[PDB]
Design a protein around this ligand. Structure first.
Ligand code: NI
Length: 222
């Protein structure tokens, strides 16, 4: 089943097992996606208590199959074509003048849910840096995710740079290098990009440390 799985609203489960400079945390997320409009609506909870890192640094790690690929570009949608068996998503993320995240995730269908299970390791972060010092604004800018085919691994690669606003009005850059490979035996796409927009908010009833996330993503560049 390719794409067909993304007609209407699909419930989402996300789990992240994290370790940054030796500080462990676990994040669980739930919500919904509608790929026909490229919309995600999600709520994440840190079940281990307050996070050792700011929530915005985890957004990109925490289901690009929910991009809306317009009709003339549906032959380039690797993410959905790999479903339901799914794909492995791996990243190295370099925070400029600070530490790096290494991530590995399995994205696939379990029943009617799309499930993103993630392991994250963070190393060489500076206390007195923007991440461990929590100097990042609680918001998110809009970016372009540049995608190309990786024919040798039957998948794709991607690279983009996230701009995180800092308290003092400067910007903290996070360079993302990404690789996706299918879990089974897909649509391999011509060079294109995803245009991303994101809002980060709070559930006023929620006592636990958490993040509500609203995302709109569309493909373009063809
Ligand atoms: Ni420490």
């Amino acid at each position: 089943k390719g794409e067909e799985l993304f007609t209407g609203v699909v419930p989402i489960l996300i789990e992240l097992d994290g370790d940054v400079n030796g500080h462990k945390f676990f994040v669980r997320g739930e919500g919904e996606g509608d790929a026909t409009i490229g919309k995600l609506s999600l709520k994440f909870i840190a079940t281990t208590g307050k996070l050792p890192v700011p929530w915005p640094t985890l957004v990109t790690t925490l289901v690009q199959a929910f991009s809306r690929y317009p009709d003339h570009m549906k032959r380039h949608d690797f993410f959905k074509s790999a479903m339901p068996e799914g794909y492995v998503q791996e990243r190295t993320i370099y925070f400029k003048d600070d530490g790096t995240y290494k991530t590995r995730a399995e994205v696939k269908f379990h029943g009617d849910h799309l499930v993103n299970r993630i392991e994250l390791k963070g190393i060489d972060f500076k206390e007195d840096g923007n991440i461990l010092g929590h100097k990042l604004e609680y918001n998110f800018n809009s970016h372009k995710v540049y995608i190309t085919a990786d024919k040798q691994n039957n998948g794709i690669k991607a690279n983009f740079t996230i701009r995180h606003n800092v308290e003092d009005g400067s910007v903290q850059l996070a360079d993302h290098y990404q690789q996706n490979t299918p879990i089974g035996d897909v649509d391999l796409p011509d060079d294109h990009y995803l245009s991303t927009q994101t809002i980060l908010s709070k559930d006023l009833n929620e006592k636990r440390d958490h993040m509500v996330l609203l995302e709109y993503v569309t493909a373009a560049g063809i």
